[PDB]
Amino acid sequence: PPVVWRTPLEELEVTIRDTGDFSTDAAAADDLIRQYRKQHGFSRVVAGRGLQLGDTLVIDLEITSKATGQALPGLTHKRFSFDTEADVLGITSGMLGMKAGESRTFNMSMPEDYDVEFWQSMPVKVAAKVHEIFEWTLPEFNDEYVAKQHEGKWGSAKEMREALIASTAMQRVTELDKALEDAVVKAVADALDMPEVPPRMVEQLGERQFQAQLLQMIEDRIGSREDVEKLATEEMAAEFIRERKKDLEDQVKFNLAVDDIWVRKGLVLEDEAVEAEFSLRARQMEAVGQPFDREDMLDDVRETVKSVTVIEWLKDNVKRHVLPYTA
């Protein structure tokens, strides 16, 4: 129960990289402008050539777990429309050169930033059949295009570019705030003498995270409730916990460390904050029609609210070093 601070909490520092600069935002705005224009683009069936970056297409898609052969819900479709240049999946690289009629099975890691948290970095097999391929010429980007096609939003080509640059730069700011939370959490985890993290505590947290992400899937309607509950297998749950063992141990060290700091810095739980987090958790559990132990939820709601309060504290009294972006 007593925590051993190898490196003191007073001499504790995080370091994070800025994740872009002006020329990165401008590039990204230019790519958003291209996607707006492609909604007003001219299309033609491609012939005597295979799929290239820039094309759009219609495909049969089937994406399955490598470990379990389970189909990822949301990602089986007979006539999926798809732009190579707005590719949330990363399936483009593995499809270049395909032609109408051709099929392909190929291995891939799901993206690390995928919206559906369950599937981040998961090794996956993609089966794809291409029904048809389309290429595009875009209208020129000038004030006339802006006035004809996005009127009332922007009064100029310049206005639109500036708007989209600001929005991309505002997104780096909130991504960076998140990397700070993660760095501050990895800081405390790393600044502890604990050669072995209590191992039921890693499994228990693995299991809670597993459930929280299955629930996020049902409430965000990213696949049928019956399909999502078909991935709630022991095999899937094993695979999830193992492929995050390091992340889960760091997270337990932090939770134990959070229990130390709470006494040391004399922090006080506000009952209104615990009841706000509990009711939020209880709504979720109702909408998905599932029972829970009130007391066990309460230990978990209390763990989460403390964690939120110690992260806020660390954020405003830990030594920040922000490194800058480089090519």
CATH number at residue 55: 3.10.50.40
- Joined together, the tokens standing for residue 285 give 């559990």
Residues 194 and 307 placed together within one structural domain of the fold: yes
Residues 80 and 180 placed together within one structural domain of the fold: no
Q: Whole-angstrom Cα distance, residue 146 to residue 175? A: 30
Which residues have a Cβ under 8 Å from the Cβ of 284 and sit 6 or more positions away?
A: 215, 219
Q: How many CB atoms are closer than 10 A to CB 137?
A: 10
- Length of the chain equals 327
Q: Whole-angstrom Cα distance, residue 33 to residue 20? A: 19
Residues 212 and 69 placed together within one structural domain of the fold: no
Q: Domain boundary residue among 95, 121, 137?
A: 137
Residues 186 and 253 placed together within one structural domain of the fold: yes
Number of structural domains the chain divides into:
2
CATH of residue 293's domain is 1.10.3120
Residues 318 and 171 placed together within one structural domain of the fold: yes
Helix (H, G, I), strand (E, B) or coil at 155: coil
Could you tell me the residue range of the domain that residue 295 belongs to?
Answer: 13-18+167-323
Q: What are φ and ψ of residue 323, in 5° steps? A: -70, 160
For every residue of 243-281, DSSP letters joined together read: TTHHHHHHHHHHHHHHHHHHHHTT----HHHHHHHHHHH
Residues 112 and 191 placed together within one structural domain of the fold: no
Rg (CA), the chain: 24
Resolution (angstroms) equals: 2.6
What experimental approach yielded this model? X-ray
Indicate whether 4 belongs to any domain: no
Chain centroid offset of residue 4 CA: 33
Residues 58 and 196 placed together within one structural domain of the fold: no
53, 84 contact by CB (below 8 A)? yes
8-state DSSP, 119: G
Indicate whether 27 belongs to any domain: no
Indicate whether 23 belongs to any domain: no
Phi-psi region of 69 (alpha: psi -120 to 50; beta: other; left: phi over 0): left
End-to-end distance of the chain based on CA atoms, in angstroms? 46
Which residues have a Cβ under 8 Å from the Cβ of 53 and sit 6 or more positions away?
A: 84, 85, 92, 96
160, 146 contact by CB (below 8 A)? yes
Q: Whole-angstrom Cα distance, residue 303 to residue 259? A: 9
